[PDB]
Amino acid sequence: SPWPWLVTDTNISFDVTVMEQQLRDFSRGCYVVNHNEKGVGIAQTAELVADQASNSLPVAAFTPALGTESLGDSNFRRVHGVKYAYYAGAMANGISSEELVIALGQAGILCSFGAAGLIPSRVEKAINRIQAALPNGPYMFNLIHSPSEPALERGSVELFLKHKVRTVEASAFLGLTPQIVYYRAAGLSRDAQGNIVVANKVIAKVSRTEVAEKFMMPAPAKMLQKLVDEGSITPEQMELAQLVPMADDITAEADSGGHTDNRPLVTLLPTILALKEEIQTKYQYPTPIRVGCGGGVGTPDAALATFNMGAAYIVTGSVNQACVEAGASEHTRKLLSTTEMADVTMAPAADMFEMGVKLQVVKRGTLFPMRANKLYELYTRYDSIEAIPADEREKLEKQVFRSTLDDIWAGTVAHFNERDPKQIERATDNPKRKMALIFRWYLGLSSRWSNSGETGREMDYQIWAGPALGAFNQWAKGSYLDNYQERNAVDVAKHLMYGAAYLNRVNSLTSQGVKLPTQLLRWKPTQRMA
Amino acid sequence: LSPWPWLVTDTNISFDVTVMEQQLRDFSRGCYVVNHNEKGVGIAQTAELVADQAANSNSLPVAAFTPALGTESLGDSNFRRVHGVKYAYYAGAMANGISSEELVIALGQAGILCSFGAAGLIPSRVEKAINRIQAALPNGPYMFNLIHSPSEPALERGSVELFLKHKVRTVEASAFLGLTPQIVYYRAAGLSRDAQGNIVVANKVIAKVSRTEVAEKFMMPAPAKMLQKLVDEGSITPEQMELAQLVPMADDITAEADSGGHTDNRPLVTLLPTILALKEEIQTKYQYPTPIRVGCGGGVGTPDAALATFNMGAAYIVTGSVNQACVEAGASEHTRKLLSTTEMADVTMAPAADMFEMGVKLQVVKRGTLFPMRANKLYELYTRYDSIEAIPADEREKLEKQVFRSTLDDIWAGTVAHFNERDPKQIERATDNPKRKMALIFRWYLGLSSRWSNSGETGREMDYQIWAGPALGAFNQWAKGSYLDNYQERNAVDVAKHLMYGAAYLNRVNSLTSQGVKLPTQLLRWKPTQRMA
């Protein structure tokens, strides 16, 4: 035995309730003893075998005082000014709302404002509110890649730069773009001491090794010289942009709610971590690149598994939409509280509909995925809305669109023409495009209906969620978290973090050969954390 | 206050990263970490208590400590004991002998459990496999795959009787949707009492499942009714029937997450806690003297994933994908070379030949073969149209020239001959159903693509159906730039030991990092910088 202590019999508890309370106490170490008869016992005080003296037992196992700060990368917590190696990911169209961002940031927890799909004045509005509530952070804003429209992306970056938004979650990118590189380089300088200052921080969320590679390596000299080209960056921005990675943190996004490649967390995260060590050994950054991970994290066990694999931080998404601070309707959050792991499925995505791309959504309690998948089948099979069989089309019009396809198209032409005339000119004299735009009316609005609580459209709510939500609901069954109105994002974050810490301590004891009562092997939500 | 009551003498500290790596890799000894004000993080393997043997010297206090713990600290020691193996690990079955006799024998010779891939093999071929494996491993360890035959109960029964005749004492039961009389017969026929100690379970069963119901059925004892039926056959005895109700139908349950081959794509991190919670329920109910165990595979291709799986509570880990790429596997040189460069995103889902019409899928390689594209096109056409005659002429002629290399009518004629000889009901059922006819025609391609890849059919390489999941891509990225880049140097025992010793190494490094030590970054992960076997 490596443990040089003895435990007095009066300091041991063989009571499983007392033992759980000792294991839950991260401020003190635990000493485990084996009584041939009363079984496993735990104490919090021990003496050296020579310092104090029979009726003493030798320490069979030990685990020291360690809490949530022992999980993940301390440099993440330092760089982002957060109390936990954790962030709540963006949720589109304000689902990761100002209320959610402010509630989490006030508790010291990073959260990403869901700017995707929101108009610029709405986003500036969120910037002002969040910065007024959190003058020193923490928070970040989602920059979603706009492949069709680089100007929108550039405007979002310029809004962030104007207001000194210092942290961006960059997602849906397939590589670098001038806009994100601009945001990155505009924040680079040096102090009077040679230390280089990275003021604009970037968390790049990726699921593909090549995209991760682009964000782990510095911005390419060519793109930076074309930014020195205009009125965008400085000769102090380029020299330094080539000595720092394009991102401080890489989020490996496994199988998730919403847009996803449905990649296993146990295969995606090791791949990105191996790439991280390759690139970090090559470039020898003074502050190393970090890799965190989300997608499937709904329970303390999944969180601990993610940390144990090497993640610098964990990311949650699906469980946060179910909390009262999220910008989801009352009906939607109620529905989410009973969604099981098999109650999600893949359905066509509005913004990549014609390319066959899908996203993960709730399928129980809503007909959205069935109707959206039917739209994709009709789109691919037929050359035009006029080629759709009459029965199918009148089913569409009366139950899905609640209007004729012609009237949907008329509204689409009016809307686009008076906003983005390129979209309607482009579909002019092309029935495939026309049909795709008509169907995207439904694909686009179903999300909004769920977010706003549009009455009478419940059967059509598009609700992004992955199996992490069902995992959460199963783990929380029989607790106060069964009530959707009792779900708070800060409380959820703390359950995941403190539960992972508890499981980590228990695993250390099990690893040392101790057989704990089954009442100590897991963290049940029998008490509120916040 | 620091919990470590030792100090470390200066001559026992190393700040050399190579030596520190050797120390962390040495699981027979503990590691004491110190912070030297000037030289930084250092490691020693011996420390002394502040009194005992030290005096005021150049000694430093222990900033962190981790004890001597290796691979035996991973998983369930009862798994290792019951199956007679050195590691809580097994290489899962790979159909049509891909998990070959040589693979089983290499792994079992190293003390590692492997499952012979009997699926799709005729009885004389399986008997030849039994002969070889038992000649090389007269006392084990090994097991054989019993795949559920829903269509054919007689074949499952024949495989069970072959296993019983030859005293095959361990079966991996897979693709089951519940109990069958055959698996129950295998389990109960191995039951007795030593009449002086306690009940003896000689025929061991590892049930690989993805659903809770089936898992529950194998965690619970065989149902009395099922045991009572055939008690009239003389297959088992009344003392075997009565003992069968005191033991679970399986000693081990493999929770199969998203995997190569047949899969429903369940996340490991959500499936495994579910099956473990069910296990603890059932074990609290029945209080078996030897507890039921739950292990896990599907996505385990790297040591970090192995460790995470163990730390969620898995009794053992299961690998598949990475084993097909090794030299002992019964895969062709073309396939093993292709697999050594298959990346994480080079796999995809394609229709399964069995339950094709039900939309059921399996995970396959898409780089180096057009099979998944062509098979998914077959499923799309099948679901869209009511008959082969409804397919547009240009699409049908493309199919016939590029996929079947034959008209669909000629495929149908050969199909009629084939099933007349082997299962005529399948043609009879198609008589008044053109949809069924089309499904049978498309299943020609779904079946033969597998046969072509397994046998190495020349000229059909672009149609090879090759089962693999992203665990292979994870392995390949983790092994990039190492000796494992060469497919000719990939050995299954070596892979297993990298997973097991890497998981133990990472567990130790995680403990030290959690305690606040900042180790040199080269030491934070287990990289294949060394051959293990």
Ligand SMILES: Cc1cc2nc3c(=O)[nH]c(=O)nc-3n(C[C@H](O)[C@H](O)[C@H](O)COP(=O)(O)O)c2cc1C
């Ligand atoms: C309803 C919902 C909306 C989301 N919207 C966005 C988004 O707009 N931009 C983005 O980068 N990620 C978005 N995500 C992804 C999350 O930020 C997070 O990465 C992911 O949900 C974590 O996986 P999980 O769902 O299994 O928890 C969204 C997720 C959900 C559930």
Ligand SMILES: Cc1cc2nc3c(=O)[nH]c(=O)nc-3n(C[C@H](O)[C@H](O)[C@H](O)COP(=O)(O)O)c2cc1C
């Ligand atoms: C090519 C291949 C063939 C397989 N054949 C079988 C089989 O015949 N029977 C079975 O039970 N499992 C079979 N499996 C599943 C493996 O035994 C194992 O459960 C699975 O591969 C583990 O998941 P992984 O691929 O992510 O490692 C096969 C897997 C592969 C890759």
Ligand SMILES: [Ca+2]
């Ligand atoms: Ca997403």
Ligand SMILES: [Ca+2]
């Ligand atoms: Ca399988």
